[PDB]
Design a binder for this molecule. Structure first.
Ligand code: DDH
Length: 291
């Protein structure tokens, strides 16, 4: 399986920048979502989810094909709740019908992070919609009630190392868990719609208590009213993970750099970019454009 990136016929950066701006303006506008958290978080998760089905062994899954659009994938239990992100993007697609789905879903994640003050994430266009037949089976996304070994092992299927895994998890600073969706309830911190290294700080600074939730699943709860999943918690249980956690807890700048590289890598896994492909684009935020 080779997936070669193919730029949408006749589109350029400017064309992409417009899609980014539309998503961004909509984020600004639909602020009531999830008790005022906004759609930022859910969009980041959607980009991560359409990309985490990848399997470096046979190259199936990943963001290329926009398969989330198909029922099999759309209805995946690990995908519960993502439908709101989809519905959010729907009108955007309508406005820019020449964009491929994989490109739109991935770009929403990038837009979200950057509009939430995170770092700039270089992005590449070229993903091609593939047939229903290419939809990966459910079951490729990770479980939350496990430990560091599980996590390490899991991430390897996506080619990510320790550092990448820790960086990537800092996305947990965003949004929250919802009982109805995953069987977990509560946010990971306080500034849940602003991109910061809060996640590491919390994991190292709170006094966490293991308890069972209303869905009968365990979670680490803090006095502050925050929570951590077993997998999140495992980052302080593993020696190697822990020191990276501390490093991020100490230098937000490091964290942003590392996050940036990993997220792009994550969204580009499984895709082959020809020599003549344009370089990655770095989009301007609304603010940088005075919009
Ligand atoms: C072991 C892991 O790999 C993993 C597990 C397991 C795991 C399980 C959960 C669960 C459970 C939920 C809550 C769902 C709900 O009830 O609504 C959930 C919420 C959010 N994810 Fe996550 N995630 C892990 C990795 C990543 C990564 C890498 C990312 C990333 C890089 O994007 C990222 C981004 C975000 C975001 C943001 C949310 C909050 C969504 C929301 O708020 O609606 N997560 N994640």
């Amino acid at each position: 399986l080779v997936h070669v990136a193919s730029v949408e016929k006749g589109r350029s950066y400017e064309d992409f920048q417009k899609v980014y701006n539309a998503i961004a303006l909509k984020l600004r506008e639909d602020d009531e979502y999830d008790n005022y958290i906004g759609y930022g978080p859910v969009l980041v998760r959607l980009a991560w989810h359409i990309s985490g089905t990848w399997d470096k062994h046979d190259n199936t899954g990943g963001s290329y094909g926009g398969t989330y659009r198909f029922k099999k994938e759309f209805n995946d239990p690990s995908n519960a709740g993502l439908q709101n992100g989809f519905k959010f993007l729907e009108p955007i697609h309508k406005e820019f019908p020449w964009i491929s789905s994989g490109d739109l879903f991935s770009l929403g994640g990038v837009t979200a992070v950057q509009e939430m003050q995170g770092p700039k994430i270089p992005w590449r266009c070229g993903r091609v919609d593939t047939p229903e037949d290419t939809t990966p089976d459910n079951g490729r996304l990770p479980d939350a009630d496990k430990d560091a070994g599980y996590v390490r092992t899991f991430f390897q299927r996506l080619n990510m190392n320790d550092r990448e895994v820790v960086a990537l998890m800092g996305a947990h600073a965003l949004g929250k868990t919802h009982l109805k969706n995953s069987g977990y309830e509560g946010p990971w911190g306080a500034a849940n719609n602003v991109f910061t290294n809060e996640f590491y700080l919390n994991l190292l600074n709170e006094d966490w208590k293991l308890e069972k939730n209303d869905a009968n699943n365990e979670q680490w709860d803090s006095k502050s009213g925050y929570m951590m999943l077993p997998t999140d918690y495992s980052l302080i249980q593993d020696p190697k993970y822990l020191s990276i956690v501390k490093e991020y807890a100490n230098d937000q700048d490091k964290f942003f750099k590392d996050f940036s590289k990993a997220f792009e890598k994550l969204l580009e896994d499984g895709i082959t970019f020809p020599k003549d492909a344009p370089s990655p684009f770095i989009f301007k935020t609304l603010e940088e454009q005075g919009l």
